[PDB]
Amino acid sequence: QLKEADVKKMLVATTHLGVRNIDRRMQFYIFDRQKDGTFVFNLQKVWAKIVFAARILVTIDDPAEIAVVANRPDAQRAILKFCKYTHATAFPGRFIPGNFTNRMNPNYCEPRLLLVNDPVVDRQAILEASYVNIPTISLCNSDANLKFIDVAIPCNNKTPMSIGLIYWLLAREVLRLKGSISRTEEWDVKPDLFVALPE
Amino acid sequence: EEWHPSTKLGRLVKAGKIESLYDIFKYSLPIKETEIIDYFFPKSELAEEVCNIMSVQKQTTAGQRTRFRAHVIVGNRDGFIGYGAGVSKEVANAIKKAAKNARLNIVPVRRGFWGGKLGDPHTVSSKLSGKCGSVRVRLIPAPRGAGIVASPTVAKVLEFAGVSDVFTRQSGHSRTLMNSVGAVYNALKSSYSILTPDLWKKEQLDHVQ
Amino acid sequence: PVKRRNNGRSKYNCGHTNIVRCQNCHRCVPKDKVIKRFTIRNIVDNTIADDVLNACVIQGFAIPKLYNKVQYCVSCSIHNHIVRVRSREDRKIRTP
Amino acid sequence: VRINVLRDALKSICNAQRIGKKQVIVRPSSKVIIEFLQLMQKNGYISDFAVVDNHRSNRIVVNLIGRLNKAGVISPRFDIPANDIEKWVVNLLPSRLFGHIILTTSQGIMDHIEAQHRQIGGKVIGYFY
Amino acid sequence: GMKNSSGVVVDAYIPRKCSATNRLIGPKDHAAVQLSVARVNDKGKMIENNYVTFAFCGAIRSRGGVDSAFMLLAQEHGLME
RNA sequence: GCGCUGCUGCAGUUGAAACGCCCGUAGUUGGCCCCCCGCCGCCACGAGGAAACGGGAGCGCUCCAGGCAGGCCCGUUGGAC
RNA sequence: GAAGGCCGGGGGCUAGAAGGCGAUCAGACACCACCGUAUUCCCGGCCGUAAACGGUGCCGCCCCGCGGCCGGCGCGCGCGUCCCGCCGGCCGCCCAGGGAAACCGGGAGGCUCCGGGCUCUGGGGGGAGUAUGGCCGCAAGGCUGAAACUUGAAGGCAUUG
Ligand SMILES: [Mg+2]
Ligand SMILES: [Mg+2]
Ligand SMILES: [Mg+2]
Ligand SMILES: [Mg+2]
Ligand SMILES: [Mg+2]
Ligand SMILES: [Mg+2]
Ligand SMILES: [Mg+2]
Ligand SMILES: [Mg+2]
Ligand SMILES: [Mg+2]
Ligand SMILES: [Zn+2]
Secondary structure, eight states: OOOHHHHHHHHHHTTTBOOSOOOTTSGGGEEEEOSSSOEEEOHHHHHHHHHHHHHHHHTOSOGGGEEEEEOSGGGHHHHHHHHHHHTOEEEESSOOTTTTTOTTSSSOOOOSEEEESOTTTTHHHHHHHHTTTOOEEEEEOSSOOOSSOOEEEEOOOSSHHHHHHHHHHHHHHHHHHHTSSOSSSOOSSOGGGTSOOOO | OOOOOOSHHHHHHHTTSOOOHHHHHTTTOOOOOTHHHHTTOTTOOOOOEEEEEEEEEEEOSSSEEEEEEEEEEEEOSSSEEEEEEEEESSHHHHHHHHHHHHHHSOEEOOEEOSSSOOSSOOEESSOEEEEETTEEEEEEOOOTTOOEESOHHHHHHHHHTTOOOEEEEEESOTTOHHHHHHHHHHHHHGGGGOOOGGGOOOOOOOSOO | OOOOTTTTSOOOSOSOOOEEEOTTTOOEEETTTSEEEEEEEESSOTTSHHHHHHHOOSSSOOOOEEEEEEEEOHHHHHHTTSSOOOOTTGGGOOOO | OOOOHHHHHHHHHHHHHHTTOSEEEESSOOHHHHHHHHHHHHHTSSOOEEEEOOSSSOEEEEEOOSOOOOEEEOSSOOEEOTTOHHHHHHHHOSOTTTOEEEEEETTEEEEHHHHHHHTOOEEEEEEEO | OOBOTTSOBOOSOOOOBOTTTOOBOOTTOTTOEEEEEEEEOSSOSSEEEEEEEEEEOHHHHHHSOHHHHHHHHHHHHSOOO
8 A cells, every 4th residue: 555645755755766778677667758768667566566575574583684785875874774773784885705605704694685775786796695595685776687686676776865765664664564663653763864964 | 623513504404403415405505514414424325436537737937837636426326426526736635625525516316217117216217418518428217137338437427326227328529537427417417307297296385494 | 710700890781892092001901991080180280370370460360270081001000009909808899 | 481380389389488488379370280289288288278260370379387398390200100119209208108209190190108009000290298 | 206116105305396487496506596475464564474485496587587477476376456 | 339421310600511693494392271082102900922040839959059859648749920 | 703814906194013223131033212014994705713701501480688770651749850669671789598619699599308491512631623534715724523652640719838
């Protein structure tokens, strides 16, 4: 289900606005193209995808085995807040090759699930996960290549507000699923924390 | 000193939580510790053999730098076979590395019948083929009592895999030992990935392991 | 073996092309294989353009240019540093 | 020019099944194609199919369910004797236990098991397993 | 699944079949994964612990199309609309 | 041995090897459709037509290579096919 | 059926086989400089070869994704030589797959799990595209095409120096 508050927040966040390029595997999520050429997503689809992803995430009993990777500087704050509130693990900054296959590496873990923001910017992590039976969930724009991506979340990734909002909604939904916070009352935390603030 | 696990799977093996190797193979889990297998073969039931020893040289400003490359296979004669290689400045260390690599990678082998079904399977389930370099191999099921019709190198592998009846054909430059052994290894590995009408049964996935 | 997918020339949908002469050695070359550059330069070198303009009597006169096209062969381009021998991976780069 | 319609159909089917597709469309229809597909269906390899009429060059739609591993034709129809089937079975099939070889006889299109049962021979069409 | 003359099974183990392609998953297919999905109470906001399990082979993952396959599978297994 | 003569079953960008291109006769190959009649091929069965050789049923030349013998109380003893 | 070459007629400016001459070199009858005949141009007619190359025969089917250009047609609107498609052609990158690899991927894929149809060629290296016959051609030469004898490697793609 989609409510007016959520849709208006998304539109003010410009989450539904994408890129000129289009992929044959993302046309199911495209609603229309503007006159300039930018493609427009469908909010029902992205909301359903968020719900399904939250179900998949909560299915994991130990939150410490979920890995969040984000080399994009815009996403860092959002991923930190997501892990802190959801008790997950972050790999900010450069992803060291061998972090999943080299057991001598000082930062080595055996995650059960992997989360990403941009396959192109985090290509190395996805490849490594392909070697050790690790599924992945990622955020995808209108032009993304699905190479070992299991679940995609259609949304823009350039605008930092879009990045922070999506993680905030995901955390809200998973927390509601876990049984801590009910659906009716608004979550205490506000999205503005997830959006990076300058100076 | 004592085997200290370095992986979640290794720790599970240290505990008695998982009891069979077929459980690990059923979920395609990579193996990184040589102890994870020897625990399941405490009596050193695994055999060992050095197929070939070759010397490789590298030209340098002052003469050549020589090194040794070794190939090793291991099996318990009961549907398990492994193959590995190792390179080192010294022969013994190369042999140790090759043995370790061969132990690390191992595959189960499916066996079947030629016509009449009589208790224990005695030959390969069906026709299998492999490819490495220019070499190709064909393994064709044979009747009971037909022996192993194959070259000495391939026959040793088929023995260590626990087969008794089989017809073989080789093509290409088979005098290159490593590529022949790799082709037969790949053919055997493919066995448990071929669908048959007996496996058409539709089973629901289970939440174990 | 084969070094370039284009075989060292730009020849598509044709059998033969007209020939040109290298401007340095006067070698005959196919038009699709010759190295071409376009230049635009002042008739008077820029060091004395101001002097010429001061000496000029006319008002608002503009210095004329030279418009020429230079065509060179493969050997002469390399010898005169018009092109460079590149690495195996940099041979595919097409931007200037 | 087009000659063997069955070969094209089988190649298309295998190509589609390779990449885990769900439906295929083969352009020219024929009685032999229909009987081949019926036998495949009775043995459990390709489930259901439909024939679409257009007056010329009827099209067909088939639904796939994996299972099939290989299919082919033998272009020149050789005349297999009734007692010469074992050699072809060994040469063509992976094992003597689950493959099928198709023959055309005066009694109709059947399998090699059925022809062995009736101790008759005929001409070969193709194979699948 | 291959029986003996007496009807006693003799295969050492039965491997897993990809939920979308019905293809056997090999002992060395390290790109093969299986996920799970949780059910939601009538009132929602609470998962019962009952899990629906799916497994996919490496080939389809490399080729893409796992997303659409998963969507159709969930639709067939659930009223996700 | 030799899938180094390739029907099963080779090769033909770079190792040996696609005629400079087009037209074209002999030759080879030719979409789909009619429910049953005639003809050709095809499959199965059968008749007819030398054995020896080969296969193969039975028989302890002391065994065997062999031969068609042989036992008493023998298919009408046998040499079937 | 390129260019060169030949026969018989025209024409004669550039360049330029042969030839001549100056330099350079130990020598230089070659490279560099200068002069210059045939030829290069047109008509009529012979010859019938080229790294005549995409070194990949012709017809036909299926086949990941992204992009550019050319020709024609249709759809839509906010009417721009806009964007969304179809057919045909010329190109680039590339997942699978293939291969000894370089690489191909509008196949060099769908093939040892080895059968769509037709045609041509090859079977270690030299001797040798030679000898001897035949056909064609004014000729130069082209098509066809051996043996004796000899030899243990010759070749391909890639790696380190
Ligand atoms: Mg070179
Ligand atoms: Mg040309
Ligand atoms: Mg050969
Ligand atoms: Mg050459
Ligand atoms: Mg050659
Ligand atoms: Mg001329
Ligand atoms: Mg040629
Ligand atoms: Mg073949
Ligand atoms: Mg020779
Ligand atoms: Zn020049």
